[PDB]
Design a protein around this ligand. Structure first.
Ligand SMILES: *Cc1c(COP(=O)(O)O)cnc(C)c1O
Ligand SMILES: *Cc1c(COP(=O)(O)O)cnc(C)c1O
Lengths: 367, 369
């Protein structure tokens, strides 16, 4: 505005619609909230109990060392807490990673149409984004490697499994990619979808944990059902993990969120149950898509990408009509040819039943 | 410094770069009996806020509204201002980091008080700013000295806390407004009002006195009187253009969904806030009595703590802090620079904690003679 402070940095001077904003725009409530990959299955009953029990302690700051959470993670994962950093979701950690490495004008390599929050952080720190097209619906490992080399980029992003296509690579291919990078380039390996992936997609911890130039990011926001709590963590060498202590808000963690995450980790039975429900919902979405003449894509995530078989304007019309006519909130990718697709999050049966009724009608109404 | 296993191409700045109570419990192998060192409000948030948290628990699978619309609307109503003037962040500490990021280029001078709020200094250093520190004047942040340092350095950023941490002192609103209006319009003032709720009304500038200034931002929190430190909810008051700059560099979905619900409920329960601010005031008086009974000198306060001059040197004050913890499980803190570090800082608390402190402090002082 004309009212802004006149001496923001030159970078600052040069610089997704959420579901609540959609409701305000459309003047209606969302009937199926299946567009942001939030887990409507919810966190475990034991986690809800832990939150309610923790409420009375919310006057205290969280432990700035995150000791109990790091220990719990370390015990679960079979690695040391010295290898672990805690942050405000993967999104918060991604911002910190960009800050740690990216100077104004530095090139940063990612996939064309890949996870947009990463791109937001890169731009906000003055990085120059270098994008690599997907190769047959997968993030192109060989192409990412070459772009890094061409630019001598200090940072590269890979999500495995991928958002928004839901695709994945075998662990051995991801490891080979990571090992091939120059040690002067940091890889952030975004494993937001660890919990829903086939085990053979995920590198063993020991395969990468000694590399100073690899950091892996995981979250409680997806399968664990705690998106609103903002708890993420990274796995790296201890020297790389320690760097977060130079630039993090030490008391920044939500005390209730940390309690919830510790409880979530403890309830592996619930995680097993919910991941089976997510898988079932992926199959249901695939059936619904196919019944409407669309092409669902294989997925290792908590959503299904669906190829709508025409162009981007058709996919957009489907998203908009689902919201306008049925109060169904989905999303779509933002670049060709990925944007031939829509992306539908998994959900309980009530939402699936609504989607099953609505999607054919939308497709019929567009013909 | 960085270790041999750290990524070898962290920025040159990065390469060049308080004990919490939980760590103290681990070190001493005991639970804290009186947690009165981090200015957390042991009075707690309102009963209605606890209910709101428990009711919101089932929705925690959803991300918070990235626009923070309902919270901004609630704050706008409470404050009597436009929601366009309001930015939301992860406490004042989170907002301070953002403010530094918005203004501070490597090497830029940033003015603050010597021994003033340390998290601000942490953020400045972390963004490559050059800290320019101004000694306190008689236990107050030296407005004249801050203004001189800004002028000398043409500093783009200056920090003022009113009321102050760690001394608890304050300036009248008219002096703060005069200070703010004397700064160059090319210098941003962050006016840290963490202690708004416990301050005398005449310490606080009216919103209208500063709200049209593009170079003033005021920061407030739910962490202190409202009893929600663990929820991490802070907000700022500024012009809309200044508020909008946060949208360029903030983690849009970063807010705790339960924390937002708690903050909205906390705002609604002004009867509870009134009650708790009176309890905090009473506890300050009790701490003053306890201090005086042990031959120490409590300082006036407009915060939720009392600074106490222990009348000797920094090593004496340190010994008091350490013995209270080791021998009695009592957690307090002290300032980190002379001559402020002649002092200890004791947070307010309910009667159970005050009673423990009243028994323990004389024993500690006696043991040190
Ligand atoms: C959902 C998601 C994130 C963000 O996770 P948070 O931990 O909630 O910040 C990051 N990366 C990918 C690929 C995601 O899908
Ligand atoms: C306690 C305190 C803060 C931190 O507040 P949060 O909102 O919890 O981040 C900031 N400034 C001062 C002066 C404080 O006393």
């Amino acid at each position: 505005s004309m009212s802004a402070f006149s001496r923001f940095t030159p970078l600052i001077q040069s610089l997704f619609v959420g579901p609540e904003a959609l409701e305000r725009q459309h003047g209606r409530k969302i009937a199926a909230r299946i567009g942001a990959n939030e887990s409507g299955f919810g966190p475990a009953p034991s986690v809800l109990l832990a939150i309610r029990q923790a409420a009375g302690d919310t006057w205290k700051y969280a432990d700035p060392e995150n000791h109990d959470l790091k220990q719990a993670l370390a015990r679960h994962l079979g690695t040391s807490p010295a290898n672990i950093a805690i942050g405000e979701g993967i999104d918060g950690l991604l911002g910190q990673i960009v800050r740690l490495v990216v100077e104004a004008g530095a090139p940063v390599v990612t996939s064309l149409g890949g996870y947009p929050t990463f791109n937001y952080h890169v731009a906000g720190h003055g990085g120059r984004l270098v994008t690599v097209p997907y190769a047959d619906d997968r993030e192109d490992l060989e192409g990412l490697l070459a772009a890094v080399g061409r630019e001598n980029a200090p940072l590269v992003y890979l999500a495995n499994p991928d958002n928004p296509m839901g695709s994945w690579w075998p662990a051995e291919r991801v490891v080979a990619f990571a090992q091939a990078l120059p040690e002067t380039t940091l890889l952030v390996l975004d494993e937001a979808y660890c919990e829903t992936a086939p085990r053979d997609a995920l590198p063993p911890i020991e395969s990468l944990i000694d590399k100073p130039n690899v950091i892996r990011a995981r979250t409680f926001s997806k399968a664990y059902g705690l998106a609103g709590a903002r708890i993420g963590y990274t796995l790296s060498t201890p020297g790389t993990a320690q760097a977060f202590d130079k630039i993090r808000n030490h008391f920044g963690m939500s005390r209730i969120g940390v309690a919830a995450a510790i409880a979530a980790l403890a309830d592996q039975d619930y995680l097993k149950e919910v991941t089976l429900k997510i898988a079932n919902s992926r199959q249901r979405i695939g059936r619904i898509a196919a019944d409407s003449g669309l092409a669902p894509l294989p997925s290792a995530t908590n959503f299904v990408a669906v190829d709508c078989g025409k162009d981007a304007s058709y996919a957009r019309a489907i998203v908009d009509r689902l919201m306008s006519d049925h109060g169904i909130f989905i999303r779509m990718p933002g670049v060709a040819p990925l944007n031939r697709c829509i992306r539908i999050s998994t959900a309980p049966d009530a939402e699936m039943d609504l989607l099953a009724a609505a999607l054919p009608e939308v497709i019929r109404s567009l013909a």
